Amino acid sequence: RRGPRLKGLRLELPLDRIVKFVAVGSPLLLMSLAFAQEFSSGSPISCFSPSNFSIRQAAYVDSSCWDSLLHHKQDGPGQDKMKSLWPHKALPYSLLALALLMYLPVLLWQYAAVPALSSDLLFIISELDKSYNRSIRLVQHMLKIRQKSSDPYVFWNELEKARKERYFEFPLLERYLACKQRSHSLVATYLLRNSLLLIFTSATYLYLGHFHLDVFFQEEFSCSIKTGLLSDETHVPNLITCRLTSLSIFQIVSLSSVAIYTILVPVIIYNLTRLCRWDKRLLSVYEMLPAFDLLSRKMLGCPINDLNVILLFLRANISELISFSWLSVLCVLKDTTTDTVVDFMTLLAG
Amino acid sequence: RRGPRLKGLRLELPLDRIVKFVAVGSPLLLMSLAFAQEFSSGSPISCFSPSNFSIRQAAYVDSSCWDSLLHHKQDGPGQDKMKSLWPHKALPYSLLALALLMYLPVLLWQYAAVPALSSDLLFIISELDKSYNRSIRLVQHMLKIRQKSSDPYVFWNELEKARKERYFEFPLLERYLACKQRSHSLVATYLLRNSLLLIFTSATYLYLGHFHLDVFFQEEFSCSIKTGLLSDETHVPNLITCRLTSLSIFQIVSLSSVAIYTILVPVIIYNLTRLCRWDKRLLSVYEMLPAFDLLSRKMLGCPINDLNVILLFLRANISELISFSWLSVLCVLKDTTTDTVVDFMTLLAG
Amino acid sequence: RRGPRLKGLRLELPLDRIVKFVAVGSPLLLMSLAFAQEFSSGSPISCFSPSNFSIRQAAYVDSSCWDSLLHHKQDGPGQDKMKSLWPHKALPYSLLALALLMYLPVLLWQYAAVPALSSDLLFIISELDKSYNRSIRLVQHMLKIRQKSSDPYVFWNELEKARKERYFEFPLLERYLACKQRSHSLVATYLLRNSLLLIFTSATYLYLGHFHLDVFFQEEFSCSIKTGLLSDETHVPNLITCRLTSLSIFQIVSLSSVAIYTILVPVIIYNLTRLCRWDKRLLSVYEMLPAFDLLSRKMLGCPINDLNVILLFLRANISELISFSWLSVLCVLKDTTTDTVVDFMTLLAG
Amino acid sequence: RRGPRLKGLRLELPLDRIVKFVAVGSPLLLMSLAFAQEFSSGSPISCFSPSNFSIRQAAYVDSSCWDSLLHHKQDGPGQDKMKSLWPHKALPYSLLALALLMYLPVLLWQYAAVPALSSDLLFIISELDKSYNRSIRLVQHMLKIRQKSSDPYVFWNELEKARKERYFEFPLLERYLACKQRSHSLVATYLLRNSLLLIFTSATYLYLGHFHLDVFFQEEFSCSIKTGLLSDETHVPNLITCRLTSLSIFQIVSLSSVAIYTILVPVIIYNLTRLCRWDKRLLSVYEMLPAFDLLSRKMLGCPINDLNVILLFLRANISELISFSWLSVLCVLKDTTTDTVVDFMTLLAG
Amino acid sequence: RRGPRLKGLRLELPLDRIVKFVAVGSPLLLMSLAFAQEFSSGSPISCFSPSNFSIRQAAYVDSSCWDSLLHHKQDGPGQDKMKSLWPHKALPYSLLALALLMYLPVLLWQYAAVPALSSDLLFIISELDKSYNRSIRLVQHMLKIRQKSSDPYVFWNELEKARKERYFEFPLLERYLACKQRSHSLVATYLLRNSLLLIFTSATYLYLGHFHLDVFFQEEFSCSIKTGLLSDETHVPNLITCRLTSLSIFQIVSLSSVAIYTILVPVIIYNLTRLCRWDKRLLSVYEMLPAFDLLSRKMLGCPINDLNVILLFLRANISELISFSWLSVLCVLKDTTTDTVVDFMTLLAG
Ligand SMILES: *[C@@H]1O[C@H](CO)[C@@H](O)[C@H](O)[C@H]1NC(C)=O
């Protein structure tokens, strides 16, 4: 039971997982599409060499014109003195670099803040189950006292006496939460990961705005082979002019990437917005029980604190651990009640 | 038992599963077929370049004419001044977009209403099994009383006394159902998912009615290569005219998609119609037992409530859980009867 | 034991499984053969273009002549004014449609009548095992009585007394069978599934009789490329005449399909014959025991009843469940007898 | 123990398994080889079209000549007026037909006589184990009586008394074997399966004699393309003459198949011969024990009986069940003896 | 223990396993190499057709020349009137035939002598473990008697008395071995398998000496196409001379096979030599104990006997069962000794 519980612990939340998967998969899918087009078209570009050229010489012209992009500019018949068509060649490598950059912050977060968070969460839940059991065991005596005397004054007096009994309130948890309220490692790592994601998205936006808008259409370009040593070769023409077939793919890729990452600009910000606010209905739900009461009163300071991330993960986990399926119903009863405690006690006893 | 039971819980119903599978498989299958044709034919289009052209120049003409679709229009010999053949090129990408769009609402429904529904169903079934056991334990005493006295007046009096015994009726369940009858999260998500499916089907209809009927046949088209820089090349012709071989595939795809999605317009509406009416024979069957009595008195309210979705899922689950195979036979006995309780008690004890 | 028994339940009969597999597999195998032929020869048809045409022009002629089948009808040199060669192109798609059509009724039967039949069968067998145990427990006392008194008059009197003991006859099963004898859901679904299979087979027969006999041989056909814009091109011929290589495959496919489905016309009819008649030797075998006697007295009604399908599946299952291996031997003894009960009791006790 | 034993039961005599595997594997292997040859050489035949023909025209001639085999005859320069070369084309399809035909009887035997044989075998072995135990438990008393009195007269008298004790001889098995000795279902199915195998082998012999000997060598053949519409084309020759490269493969295939099936004519006959003779050393071995004594007295009847097949599978199974390993050694002792029962009892007790 | 032990029994010896694997793997490896060569070069032979011939005519010449090997002879410029080059074509088929031939005796041995040997070994080991336990139980009393009286005369007398105690010597084993010493089934099958291996090796030697030495080099050969109908074609040459590229592979294959099988001529003979001599140090080691003594006194008979094969397998198995882990050490002690029994008893008790 305990062993399986530790393994099932969610240490990356349910929503950030989809963001990570999208941000790491989209560039890989686009790069795979680029390679698929490269191997489907056979030749990345096609050139209109004169009829005299044999097949091997035409292939030489094709290869030399396609390989001379990263080194020298090539100008089309609508452009200024120079235009750079290098992004057509380095597209898949840039996509791989983007994928690695987007994956980096995930590795940073995991390696830097998985162990401390795991230890804190497991300790807290282990203490909290026992705390809940100890808190509930007193409800029987509370019910007996309430049955004996109906007036609410004695009920309140006995509630205060039980709170002062000192059989609970777990000073271990008190001091641990007090220490956590100062720590900043978890919030630092979370904010840093989100900021890295935002910075890399902005880097992609800049890359696609500077080096893709200029040559977005760039149908054809006038290549040259005489720049080398065969400058005295009269057989070859001077300015063989040719085009690149995969252009459409390139276009789509660029646009596609932009769109996807725009969808990820709000969501990520929302993830960063979660910390600035304490997690309210559930707060009122858990205020009643002493076991959760101790951690409920630790929300007077600035919302940015190491205990805030622990609270987020604790809620995301207790939604399934099992220790939440009851108090919610009890507080639903309390909301419905104009007796609620008696009904809850009967249900718990059953 | 409890662990395996929660795993087997059906959280997506049996009928909607087929619709979800179809709406995603169909576009993916059509896209795979399109790619298979593209790699089987080798060239998406074929062009009738003059004899003088070498193989490389003919390949250049083919590539330039096929790549100049998304950018410029191409006119056939039966058309108006202009006609755009771009849908021939962006077909697989549009299929990707449609597949993602149809998969989106499934993800929305899952991530937004799987956990609340799962918890509610688990709690309800856990309470209901014990409720049924407690209800049946009293049938023995009822049988003893009936054996002692045969008149029906004492039967009615003892039934009323048992109903007033307060050993059951589970006020927990009463308050939970009362609270649920106000919730709207589950119905909101269900209606939103169905409406998203309908909206995306209408979007596909509009897309295939606007951008496919015009170029549905469009056998051939007259391409041009002189639009670029090689406008002084007398060697090349002016208006090389050529055709696209995969046309038939395209045609079929369009038609096929339409048909399939039409089949999904009624079914989805039926899914939306399930909520407008409370689930009648089964209601009368379960009215008898006190355990199901509490949840069978909620039919008065408006059909659109969070308890309605829970009722649908509860019926779909109880059809196989085990807690239904008995009461159905007991109410069949009641219908057949002009002793039934004694026979049912004997069967349950066995 | 109980859990494994439920899974092992045969809910589709042994014979109908082979019919389903054949009907859903034959078209898929033929379609795979068609695609294999399409990709083995490289091209579906071959055309005899003049010598002047380059390779690219010949490929254009081939593609345009093969793609102009669905859109226009071509004419061979043995035919009337015009003939339709479109079935050569839409063959694999028609095979896909046929496979889906034949698979549809299986899905209908499953989704519509798997749960009710499963519940009824499991309940009936669960009752019947303990019913047989209770019935056999009395054979010891019966044997003691027979040993004490040898005359058959007392034997018959004690048999009647035991039948009237009211310790068995399970009124639950009496009423359940009385109810099932009116239901018609299972028979309706079974008849509908078989009728759908027959209707789809007849549809295939009509399709192959209308759209394949006309162009069954159709060796060659005269294609034309001037129909488009290039009507002023004197270089091209007028009526390029060419042939389709895969014809033989097509032929075989058609014939093959016909044959297979003919084999399925009797068998399916035989499946519909099983309902019109009740399942006789086994009936007399099971008449003796009280446990099976109750369901053995329902043969008077009409053969078409919901209890008939349940009987068929019950026999098909009890052939392996274990509850049949004994009574058959006991009735074999009874047939051989000119003591049998004592021998059967000894065997059962062992 | 019991469960695993049922699964391990053999319902296909070891020897027949190899025949079943061979008769369905050889044609499949040959067909795979034929397809491998078809795809290794690229084209099934090669034709010697004149030099003027372009590559596409030569491919058209090849396809039309290879496709015109099933439709029209083709004559070589050594033949009569006509010769039919269609077996070259329909070879793999005929191999598929042969494989299906050979597999059909296996399916018939399974579906028609697996369940009855399985039930009979399992019942018989289940009874026989306890029967052997009961027979053995009396050997101790027999040994004590023999020790008390050494004369053989008292030994024979006590043996007769034990045989008459009525504590065994299992009248259940007496009646069951009496009923089985008249049944003919198992022998009918076995003989029918063997006869089907023989008939299909004879069909293959006839097919390979009528349609493969005539064109066994048939090196070349004179094809023609003018039969169609292009009878006014002076460019094409009249009687293009060409050959088929895979001939050798074809030859081998034919021969190979013949050889294999000849090997299967004796073996199958042997399988049919086993029924005509009752299973002799083992019969004398098992005659001694009372448990096997009852089933050893049925040899008088005609060899063809359902009990004969049950005996065959019973021996094939008891060779490994475990019940055979003892009595064989005991009868070996009896053969060696000029005390044996005492030694056997000691071994069994150990 | 008993179940796992029977599975672990080795019924094929360790040394013969390597021979069986090699004799079936080598030809398969060579055949795979031959097919790999056939598909690596594209064509099996190359022919020097004149320049006038087009590509298709050259392919026709290649195919016709390579296909006329099995039918007609072809002579090079160093040979007699005729030389046969058919072994170049039937090489992989001959390799398959050889692989099947070498695998046949393995199947024969398995199907004919796996069950009898398995049963004999199982019974022997099962009785032998108990025999050893019974034999060792008396060593304690032997030690007590030796301690009481030190003289060896009483030790010998008590050893004889124990041998005559009749509490062991297992007459079952005596009679089983006596019966086995006459049986010849196992020796017959073993010798037949070895002789089949030798005969097939000799057949391969003859095949490679007759049909490979003649045409071992046979660089080129003169092919003719005019033998057919096209004898009036002046366009074609008369005696096209051409070569076969894979020759080297062929050569190697032949040589390789020879070498491997020579390595298998001694080893197999050694396997046949094992039976002519009874298995000596181990015999003297096991002669001491009464359990092994009974089977150690059968060495007098002829070496060829069914008990000899059982002895070989029994030693090969007892080398790993566990029952040998002590007696070997005990006889090592006896060899070392100028007390040994006491030390052995202490070790066995521990
Ligand atoms: C064609 O080839 C000749 C020599 O091979 C060369 O002089 C001429 O420049 C070539 N044509 C063009 C357009 O360069």
Ligand SMILES: *[C@@H]1O[C@H](CO)[C@@H](O)[C@H](O)[C@H]1NC(C)=O
């Ligand atoms: C054929 O080639 C010549 C020169 O190479 C060119 O002038 C002519 O335009 C070409 N034919 C066509 C139809 O363009």
Ligand SMILES: *[C@@H]1O[C@H](CO)[C@@H](O)[C@H](O)[C@H]1NC(C)=O
């Ligand atoms: C052959 O080519 C010439 C010109 O290229 C053309 O006029 C003629 O029609 C062609 N042959 C045929 C049969 O069309």
Ligand SMILES: *[C@@H]1O[C@H](CO)[C@@H](O)[C@H](O)[C@H]1NC(C)=O
């Ligand atoms: C060669 O071609 C010419 C015309 O292209 C044709 O008349 C002649 O028949 C051809 N040769 C043969 C052997 O058919």
Ligand SMILES: *[C@@H]1O[C@H](CO)[C@@H](O)[C@H](O)[C@H]1NC(C)=O
């Ligand atoms: C070359 O071709 C001519 C006719 O096309 C033919 O007569 C001659 O034999 C050929 N040369 C050779 C070496 O076959």
